[PDB]
């Protein structure tokens, strides 16, 4: 019993956009489907609900731009028109017991970007310190990868550490002020034989293509 959203992508302003909530487990002749969105860094915002009979009720700010439709026994569509940059949000669907949006079963959300910028793939660069500034008796080291200049969100950075155990940490994306593209920093902290070990970050960017993968293999010190 779960829900999953699909169809969130990058479109220009004024382009119509259709999202799909695919349900597994429960029936839509018993349960309603809510739509909730959330702007980046902002709060939750209710959009609308479709009941079992097909009737849709929306928020005051919607103004007929949103429409909900039952397409199959497992799929519910949300059609959006007159989209501007204020509609850039992560859109959730949720299994509703009644007309209240109080529920414990939510989709993971799909990310919608409304902009006139181009789909750009990330440039991945290694982050290593000055080797004279790293102590020779250092038991652990901090290295990282900079994935910059991509649009839209998200990127996913995973790490290959070889035989060493490491802890990873990915910072939130920053909007570059000149271009509007995003940039992230993923960091890896390993201990042990890091002096002779090769490390790889694997940066995936699904808005470019579903199999877009960049592997940056590097060491801490270029001795």
């Amino acid at each position: 019993q779960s829900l999953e959203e699909s169809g969130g992508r990058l479109v220009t302003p004024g382009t119509p956009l259709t999202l799909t909530c695919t349900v597994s487990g429960f029936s839509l002749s018993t349960y309603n489907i809510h739509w909730v969105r959330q702007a980046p860094g902002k709060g939750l915002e209710w959009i609308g609900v479709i009941d079992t009979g097909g009737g849709t009720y929306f928020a005051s700010w919607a103004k007929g731009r949103f429409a909900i439709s039952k397409t199959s026994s497992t799929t519910v569509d949300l059609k959006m028109t007159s989209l501007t940059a204020a509609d850039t949000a992560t859109y959730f669907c949720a299994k509703g017991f009644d007309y209240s949006a109080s529920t414990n079963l939510w989709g993971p959300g799909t990310l919608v970007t409304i902009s006139s910028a181009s789909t750009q793939s990330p440039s991945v660069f290694p982050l290593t310190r000055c080797c004279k500034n790293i102590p020779s008796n250092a038991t652990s080291v901090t290295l990282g990868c900079l994935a910059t200049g991509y649009f839209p969100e998200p990127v996913m950075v995973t790490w290959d550490t070889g035989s060493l155990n490491g802890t990873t940490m990915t910072l939130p994306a920053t909007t570059l002020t000149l271009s509007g593209h995003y940039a992230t920093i993923s960091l890896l902290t390993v201990s042990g034989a890091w002096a002779k070990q090769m490390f790889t970050c694997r940066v995936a960017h699904t808005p470019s293509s579903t199999d877009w993968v960049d592997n940056k293999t590097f060491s801490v010190c270029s001795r």
Binding site: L44, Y57, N104, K132
Partner: protein, 217 residues
């Protein structure tokens, strides 16, 4: 037209302490009790804690207690853990089939002061072939959130060419981590020698500086 007012927007309490989050509506909710409470973390959908103003959701712990009726509602989180560092929302349902979310309240776990560990990263040689140079300053594992990062390029204080990123509060040691990225062109990067990052925090008695020289790595 109608408002759902959530106060405060931010609150801090230690492990074992308690917080109170209030939601005040301009009109009474449906049946005087159709009010829910959510917990949300970064990149995740919100998780239901309380529905029908006071009924605990299945799987939420007993330490989450809601109360209220009509227009005034209160979520009380007693016996705080580091896992509870998240943003919490209330959700009211109204006559007319209307749902209105509250503005949100950030719950921060209060802990001891930790000074940041500073690291500096020179730009890679692969990035310099593309005409852009990014210098990265990392502030690792500090509390509280408030710190100030200053860039100095040949002792000249920079302005307008740096951006910062802060993580959410950690679910284990309740610290923050921050990165500041200095963006310069390749022609501007190779005209200067000393690149310094000066970090000021309340746990540091004096501003700590980590620096490097270009090409002298």
């Amino acid at each position: 037209e109608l408002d759902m007012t959530q106060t405060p927007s931010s609150v801090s309490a230690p492990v074992g302490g308690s917080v109170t989050i209030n939601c005040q509506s301009s009109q009474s909710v449906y049946g005087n009790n159709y009010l829910a409470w959510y917990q949300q973390k970064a990149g995740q959908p919100p998780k239901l804690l309380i529905y029908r103003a006071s009924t605990l959701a299945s799987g939420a712990p007993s330490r989450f207690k809601g109360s209220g009726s009509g227009t005034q509602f209160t979520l009380t989180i007693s016996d705080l853990e580091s896992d509870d560092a998240a943003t919490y929302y209330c959700l009211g349902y109204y006559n007319g089939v209307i749902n209105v979310f509250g503005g949100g309240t950030n719950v921060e776990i209060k802990r001891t002061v930790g000074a940041p560990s500073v690291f500096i990263f020179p730009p890679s040689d692969e990035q310099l072939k593309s005409g852009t140079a990014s210098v990265v300053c990392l502030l690792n594992n500090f509390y509280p959130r408030e710190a100030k990062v200053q860039w100095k390029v040949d002792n000249a204080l920079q302005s307008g060419n740096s951006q910062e990123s802060v993580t959410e509060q950690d679910s284990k040691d309740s610290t923050y981590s921050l990165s500041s990225t200095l963006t310069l062109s390749k022609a501007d990067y190779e005209k200067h020698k000393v690149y310094a990052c000066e970090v000021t925090h309340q746990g540091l008695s004096s501003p700590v500086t980590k620096s490097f020289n270009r090409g002298e790595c």
